[PDB]
Amino acid sequence: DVNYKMHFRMINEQQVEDITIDFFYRPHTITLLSFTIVSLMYFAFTRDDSVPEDNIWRGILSVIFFFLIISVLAFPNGPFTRPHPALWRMVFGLSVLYFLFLVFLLFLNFEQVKSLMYWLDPNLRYAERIISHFDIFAFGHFWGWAMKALLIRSYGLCWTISITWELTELFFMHLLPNFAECWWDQVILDILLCNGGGIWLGMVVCRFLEMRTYHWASFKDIHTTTGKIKRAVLQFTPASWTYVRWFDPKSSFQRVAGVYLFMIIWQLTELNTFFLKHIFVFQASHPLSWGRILFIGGITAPTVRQYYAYLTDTQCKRVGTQCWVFGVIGFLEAIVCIKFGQDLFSKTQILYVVLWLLCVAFTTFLCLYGMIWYAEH
């Protein structure tokens, strides 16, 4: 029983090792208490508040900012400790804010959510060929799949969802009877170039990061100018890497069905992004579109590393809180999409979605046959 509480404190709050510069790791939480009061003392007695709209906006920014200070003090930092554990406490603190925002949205009607997002941006109310198909949003697909394949560490898992989703996104063409988007982009250029190339780069890098010896010197010990610039930059790369193996030659039916739930919460999060963009109409260049994808992408890095630990390690006995909060966010967005988007469909095709998981299990099972038959042969 000592192991459970000890093993959970590696998933939830990984601790720093070989602390040599103790300035960055020694809490000063009365210089934080004094800074918060003197900051708010300046924003109270000097800031003009004759504009009612600006008071509400600046109030939100301060509530969000001072919830990140609470996150640094109290929230767990996941399984990550670079560049600093406090970044991953503030990354977790934003997950709780987004989770509670989705809880609130579930009780408002459609007109109140539409009016809420016409307050964030008033403009929302009024709203050879290969080269053009690559743009700043192609880097989002490429570098998103490069990051995902880094922590999934499986060609089969990544290509099963890079293929099935881009087939699903092409099937959802009756939602879009206006834009003349050609099918070749979703099946050829996305699967092969953005997703296919991005997966390879994240798998080439991950292979490097697991054959790398992590002997970390101390920033004080180095006595060359180029050496300190080298060690400061490398503080933003992983300290170590865990060898990820999802299946085994003898994998329990609980392990097969834990990987299968992974490929369904994962493949649901690609369905929330598609629908949240269609129900609440905003373009891909709006900060609500790419800002949320960056945030969900940032939550994914410690969620994949906490789901893997719980799924495989036999002494964990608890799922980390960041993996918990990602679970509700992925599921609450679906309810928001179902509740608000009840008019964009007339004949609902959930048969495709029902067919969408049958061909995912049938393909995970082909991954099991691939591994088991390869070990013997």
Added chain:
Amino acid sequence: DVNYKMHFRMINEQQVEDITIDFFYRPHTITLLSFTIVSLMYFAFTRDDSVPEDNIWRGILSVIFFFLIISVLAFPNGPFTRPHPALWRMVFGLSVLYFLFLVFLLFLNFEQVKSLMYWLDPNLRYAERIISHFDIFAFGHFWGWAMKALLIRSYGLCWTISITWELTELFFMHLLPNFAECWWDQVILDILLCNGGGIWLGMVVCRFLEMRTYHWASFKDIHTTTGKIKRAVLQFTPASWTYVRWFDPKSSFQRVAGVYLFMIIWQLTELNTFFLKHIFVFQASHPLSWGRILFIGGITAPTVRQYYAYLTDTQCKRVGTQCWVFGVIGFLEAIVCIKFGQDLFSKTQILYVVLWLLCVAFTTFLCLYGMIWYAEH
């Protein structure tokens, strides 16, 4: 360095001892996730949302409830572990919610706060002798002072702050030139009877609880129904008691300054309770008054214990997060009172307030002389 992190975890998250009924202490957080998702599914797909005000109110309620759940998952439980640590995690979560609400209020103007509190309760817009002076609010004063004296374990501190604050509240009579309240109440009945009796009862109970042997049996081991009822009721009393001694015969000036800061924040909280009520006009029977007083009294106990631990224990080296949040809440309430209440005073008497701390240091210094001279004599 090992002791600091170990000693802080005895103040931030005290762990349970002699767990015999493991049902109450084994996390089931995927069941929590499923319950949250199904509850929100029901509230989304069955609740009528044609009334916007009801939508906003129920959204606030649900956000608070699920922040309580998040605090059960992630927030620390202070130095207390009875009846369950989760109650104190939820208490800390409510502390954080109130602190963020105070952060938000500092940017709104007076009219926006008035409109907000009229939204909370629309009625706010339209708003022999000894026996009558005793009511349920007298009971509130009595039991609050009983709890305070229980956690401070000092006649000197409690009586000093009681006398000083009642004198201050009597002095603040130019704020109230309409109600015909006299000095008799505040100087006699609110010192000798209510506060005096509460302090005496709290000190008697603390003396009992620090001479009590806490041999806790197991609810399963007892084989008499009366015994099981007895052990179930006693789960809501402290498991142990700490002998509290603020001063010493040889007390460092740091200890004297820490006790002085403790007393100053205590009297500041009393001032906040007075000024919030007189600025934002709500009567003493409104939930905004007594609910806030109950909430602050609930925050006070782990705050007092953690402040004592940090002040006296030499290996703590960090102040618990609940104490941090309590201090920031008190200071933010003071800032709110200063910012919004700038019209209820014309000639500001801070000389009395300046005189209010000089006579607290003098009275603390008489406590030091009392202890030191008593030990030799």
